[PDB]
Amino acid sequence: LTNSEKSRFFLADLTGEVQSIPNTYGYISGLGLFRSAPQTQTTFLMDLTDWD
Amino acid sequence: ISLLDAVDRTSRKAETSAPERVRQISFPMMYFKEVESITPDEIQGVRQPGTA
């Protein structure tokens, strides 16, 4: 199947491949808590009001 | 109401009951008043919070 470890005139089969994908976490972006508010300017203001 | 007291038969004595008691009362009640005014100087030039 494939050329041998230390000679080009001998064969040795390649039996597949193994991969190691890193660990990615979620469960915070999974919950629909943060609603997206797209805007146009580089900064935004907000008004605070209250009474008693 | 009260309990009867035993009396002898030959001496034909008895008991009596007190009459009713009726009275009268009256009630005064509280009065609440609240006043608010709208003046154009609180509307002219002022900006609605939350609006640009």
Structure tokens at B20: 């009713």
- Residue B50 with chain A: CB contacts under 8 Å: 47
Chain B: closest CA distance from residue A47 (Å): 6
Rounded Cα distance between B43 and B48, Å, is 9
Residue in chain B nearest A46 by alpha carbon: B50
Residue bearing tokens 């230390």: A6
- Residue B49 with chain A: CB contacts under 8 Å: 47, 49
Chain A: closest CA distance from residue B46 (Å): 14
Rounded Cα distance between A11 and A3, Å, is 5
* b/e burial code for range A23-51 (CB count within 10 A of at least 16 → b): eeeeeeeeeeeeeeeeeeeeeeeeeeeee
* Resolution as reported, in Å: 3.1
- Touching A: B residues 1-52, CB under 8 Å: 49-50
CA distances from A27 to A24, A31, A33, A34, A37 (A): 11, 6, 11, 12, 21
